[PDB]
Design a protein around this ligand. Structure first.
Ligand SMILES: O=c1[nH]cnc2c(Sc3ccccc3OCP(=O)(O)O)c[nH]c12
Ligand SMILES: O=c1[nH]cnc2c(Sc3ccccc3OCP(=O)(O)O)c[nH]c12
Ligand SMILES: O=c1[nH]cnc2c(Sc3ccccc3OCP(=O)(O)O)c[nH]c12
Lengths: 276, 272, 274
C-alpha cells in the first residue's frame, strides 16, 4: 500500500552495496530460533533501524551449513498494529536480493489432540482467517514485476521440502517423530476461548498461531519455494473443566526448551534445499 | 466519504444527461462483457465523466426493458472501501431502478457443479461482513433504508422460479445454491476450500455480496447468478491450480449463453 | 489506538473529582435495561458529552446497596466506531477502581431449545471480528493495563454464573435460566439462513453485535466479568419461513423483559464478591 516498487528496489540496492553476501535462502525465525544466527559462518548483522524503509530486530547474512542465507531475527505481527504491507515488506526485499527459497518458523497452539508440547509440525497447508475478510497482504494494486494479480495458494508448501524434512529428521535419530498438518492464522494477541478452539478444530486446523500466513502469501506471489514449521508450545484449552490457561511465559519456556533441537534441524535441512 | 447530497448530485447529473429511465440495473460479471452490444438506443458514460464515481455505465433497452449496465465493477481486492464498491447501487436507487441483476464468476465447491454451469444464487455467506467489512457500517440514512435490515429474503424467490422456467424454454440444468464471498485476491488453499464446503457454500467468489446488501437496504428486488469457471482444488494429490487465465477462458466460452439468458429473462421481471 | 495512557487517566481523574461515588461494579446496559438506572440510590448523572475523551449517560450510585457505575447507551462496531473507542469506557472503569463488569445485550436464538424472552448466561464467546484483526488489544500493549497476550478461556467468572443460577431459582421464575456461547458479528444487517446455519455449526447458541470487545478489554485489565443475553428472536434457519428479523421485534422483546431483567440484576448485586 504505502511502498512503491522503487522503495523495495532502494532497500535491496542498499543491502547489496553493504554486504558481499548473496543469499539463496531467507529464514524468518519464529519461537525457539533466537540463536540460529549463532551457527552462521561469515555472519554480517544489520539492525532493522539501519536499513532504509524497514518498518520501525536484526537481519543477519551468512552461511548456514555452507548455504548462503539471510535470517530475520524478530518478525512483525498484525497484533503489534503493523499493516500487512509492512509485515511482508522484507519478503519482497528478499526476492529482489535473489532469494529463491523461504523457510518460515513460528510457535503454535496444538488443536490436534495427538500433538504434545515440544512437537515440531511441518506446515502442509494453512487457513487464512484474516484473508477471508480482507486482511490479505496482496490487497490493492498488483505490480506484475512481483507477480500475478490472482495467485494460487493450493501448492504453497513445497512437497519436496516436506519429504526431505521427514527424511532429515529420521537420520537425526530424534526421540519423537515430526508432526504434519494445517496452520490457522488468527490475528490475536489474546488467546482463544474454549468455543473458539472448538471452531478452529472443526475447521480442520491442527495448530493455531499469529503470523506466517502473510509472509507465505507474498513469497508465493513472488515465486519463492516455501517450507515452514510450527513449534507446538502448548495444548489449547478445549474443555471448561481445565483450570490451565494459555500464557506467553509457557510459549517462551517451550521455545527455550526446543531451541537446540530446532537450530540443529534447520542447519542440517539447508543441505537438502535445491541449488539455484 | 459520501454525503447524501453527493449521491443525489450524481443521480441528478445522469438524469439530466440521458432521457433513459432504467427500471433494471445489471452489474456485469465474468462472461457479460458484450451484453451492452445487445442494447437498443445505447448511451455510454465513462465512469470518469460521472460526478463522484470511484469502466462504463450504459443506458438502453435490453429486449425492450429499460436498463443501466455496469461494465466493469469495483472489487474489495483492488483496495476500494465498500462505500466506494457499492456507491453505484445507491445511485441506481435514486435513478428509479427497482431491480438489481448481479452476475459474477465463482469457483465450484459443490462437487455436482461442472465448469460452464450457471448457479442461481439462492443465498450468500458474507465472511467479510462477520468481521466488520459490511457496506452499511457507519451512520444510517433513513432516506436509503432501515438501520438493521434483514438479508434472509435477499434473493427474490419469484425471479429464481422464472429463471428456472426461462432456462427450460432456452443441455445442462440451471444450478442453484449459496455463494460465499471471500476478499481474495489469492485463490484458496485445499484446507480453506474444505472450510467453505463445511460452511455449506456451493460456490466462492470475490464480489456481489456488498452490492446485494446495499440493494436490499434501499428496497431493490435482487436476482443473481454465478458462472462456475473452475472446480476449486479439494485434495493434495492434484497438480491442477486455479488461475485467472482459466477464469477468463470459461467466461469467454459461456458469454453467448449468458447474454442470451439475461436478455430473455428481462421479459420475466415484474413491471414497476 | 488514538488514546494514550494519560487520556484514560485524565478521564478517570475528571470523574473522581466530579463525584464522591467510588464504584466497585460497572454495568453496561443492553436491551431491556433502559430503566435500571431508575432503581439507583444517590444517583449522579454525567452525559457522555460532558466527560473528557468520551467518544448516552454514565450514572453513579448504589444498586441494592452496591456501589455501581452504569453505561446507559453503549457504542457498537456497526455505528462506525473503532474498537479502541467502543471499549474506552472499560479502561476508565478500571482506573475508577471497578473490579467487576456486568455486560448485557440482546441476541438472536441459534439454540433450538431457546424461546423469545429467555435469558442466556454467557458461559463463553466466539469473537469472529477478533480472528480477522478486529481485536480491541491490537496495537502497542501498556503493561499498566495488562499482559501483551491475555488468556480468554476463563473470561466469564464461574462463581458469578453459579450465583446467577441460585439467584434465579430463589426468584421462582416460570422458565429456567439458559446458558451458552455468544457469537459476536459486526452487523448491522441480520443474518441470512446460510449464515445462521454457519453460526449454529460453529457451536454458537446466540448471536449479537456487541459485548465481546468490552469483555476482552475487561479481562485484559483483570476485571471479573458476568454477562447475559436477552433472546429477542429465533433466527430464521429455513427458506420456507416468511418471518424476518427486525429491530422493532428486538425493541418489543426488550420492553416485555425489562421488569424481569431489572429485578434479576438488582438482586444479583448482593451475590457479587466484596
Ligand atoms: O494457544 C495458542 N493460540 C494462538 N497462538 C498461539 C501461539 S503463537 C504466539 C503466541 C504468543 C506470542 C507470540 C506467538 O507467536 C509469535 P510467532 O512465532 O508467530 O513469531 C502459541 N500458542 C498459541
Ligand atoms: O476458485 C475461485 N475462488 C475464488 N474466487 C473465484 C472466482 S471469481 C474471480 C476470480 C479471479 C478474478 C476475478 C474474479 O471475479 C470477478 P467477479 O466475477 O466477482 O467480477 C472464480 N473462481 C474462483
Ligand atoms: O438475530 C439477531 N442477529 C444479530 N444480532 C441480533 C441481536 S442484537 C441487536 C439487534 C439489532 C439491533 C441492536 C442489537 O444489539 C444492541 P446490544 O444489546 O448489543 O447493545 C438481536 N437479535 C439478533
Amino acid at each position: 500500500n504505502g511502498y512503491t516498487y522503487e522503495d523495495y528496489k532502494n532497500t535491496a540496492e542498499w543491502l547489496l552495496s553493504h554486504t558481499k553476501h548473496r543469499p539463496q535462502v531467507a529464514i524468518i525465525c519464529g519461537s525457539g530460533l533466537g540463536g540460529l544466527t549463532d551457527k552462521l559462518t561469515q555472519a554480517q548483522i544489520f539492525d532493522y533501524g539501519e536499513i532504509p524503509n524497514f518498518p520501525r530486530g536484526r537481519l543477519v547474512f551468512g552461511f548456514l551449513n555452507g548455504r548462503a542465507c539471510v535470517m530475520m531475527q524478530g518478525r512483525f505481527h498484525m497484533y503489534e498494529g503493523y499493516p500487512l504491507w509492512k509485515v511482508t515488506f522484507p519478503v519482497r526485499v528478499f526476492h529482489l536480493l535473489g532469494v529463491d527459497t523461504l523457510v518460515v518458523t513460528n510457535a503454535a497452539g496444538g488443536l490436534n489432540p495427538k500433538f504434545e508440547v515440544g512437537d515440531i509440525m511441518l506446515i502442509r497447508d494453512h487457513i487464512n482467517l484474516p484473508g477471508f475478510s480482507g486482511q490479505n497482504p496482496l490487497r490493492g494494486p498488483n505490480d506484475e514485476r512481483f507477480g500475478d494479480r490472482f495467485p494460487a495458494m493450493s501448492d504453497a508448501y513445497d512437497r519436496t521440502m516436506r519429504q526431505r524434512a521427514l527424511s532429515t529428521w529420521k537420520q537425526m535419530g530424534e526421540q519423537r517423530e515430526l508432526q504434519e498438518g494445517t496452520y490457522v492464522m488468527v490475528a490475536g494477541p489474546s488467546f482463544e476461548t474454549v468455543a473458539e478452539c472448538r471452531v478452529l478444530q472443526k475447521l480442520g486446523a491442527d495448530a493455531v498461531g499469529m503470523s506466517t500466513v502473510p509472509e507465505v502469501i507474498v513469497a508465493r506471489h513472488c515465486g519463492l519455494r516455501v517450507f515452514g514449521f510450527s513449534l507446538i508450545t502448548n495444548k489449547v484449552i478445549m474443555d471448561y473443566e481445565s483450570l490451565e490457561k494459555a500464557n506467553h511465559e509457557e510459549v517462551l519456556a517451550a521455545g527455550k526448551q526446543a531451541a537446540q533441537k530446532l537450530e540443529q534441524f534447520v542447519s542440517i535441512l539447508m543441505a537438502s534445499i535445491p541449488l539455484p
